[PDB]
Amino acid sequence: FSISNLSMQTHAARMRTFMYWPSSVPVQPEQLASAGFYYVGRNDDVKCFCCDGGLRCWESGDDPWVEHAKWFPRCEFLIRMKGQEFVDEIQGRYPHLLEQLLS
Ligand SMILES: CC[C@H](NC)C(=O)N[C@@H]1C(=O)N2[C@@H](CC[C@@H]1CCNCc1ccccc1)CC[C@H]2C(=O)NC(c1ccccc1)c1ccccc1
Numbered sequence: 001f002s003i004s005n006l007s008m009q010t011h012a013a014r015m016r017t018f019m020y021w022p023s024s025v026p027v028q029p030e031q032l033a034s035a036g037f038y039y040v041g042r043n044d045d046v047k048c049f050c051c052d053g054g055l056r057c058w059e060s061g062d063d064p065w066v067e068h069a070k071w072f073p074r075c076e077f078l079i080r081m082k083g084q085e086f087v088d089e090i091q092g093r094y095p096h097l098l099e100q101l102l103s
């Protein structure tokens with residue numbers, strides 16, 4: 001088990017980073033902090049403390065756990081938290097993501 005950011009290990013620590021999170025963003029800090037994410041200070045850019053995965057451009061209805069599974073399926077935190085079945089389900093829902101983001 002190897003973490004990327006030991007300082008952002010706890011929920012309380014990640015919550016602290018959302019102090020200056022833009023009020024206009026339609027995703028709530030607690031939902032993002034719970035999915036292992038913390039605010040990186042630029043735009044609406046969040047990173048996972050474990051896999052170092054970065055996400056941005058948060059739209060309304062976006063589920064942080066689904067997005068975590070969608071883009072960073074091998075994250076060991078996402079797996080002990082949500083399980084292989086969930087990760088495999090989301091992966092099945094979006095089976096050509098590389099070719100989705102590659103134009
Ligand atoms: C997260 C929710 C958002 N919207 C669902 C989304 O999926 N957003 C996506 C997203 O973020 N990412 C994926 C694809 C981009 C889209 C944005 C387009 N949404 C339009 C849309 C409209 C309608 C339907 C679907 C989608 C790739 C991984 C991540 C990302 O770009 N990370 C960057 C980053 C780095 C550092 C820190 C933070 C973030 C980064 C960028 C380039 C290289 C490396 C890392």
Ligand SMILES: [Zn+2]
Pocket residue numbers: 036048049050051052053068072075076077078
């Ligand atoms: Zn992760």
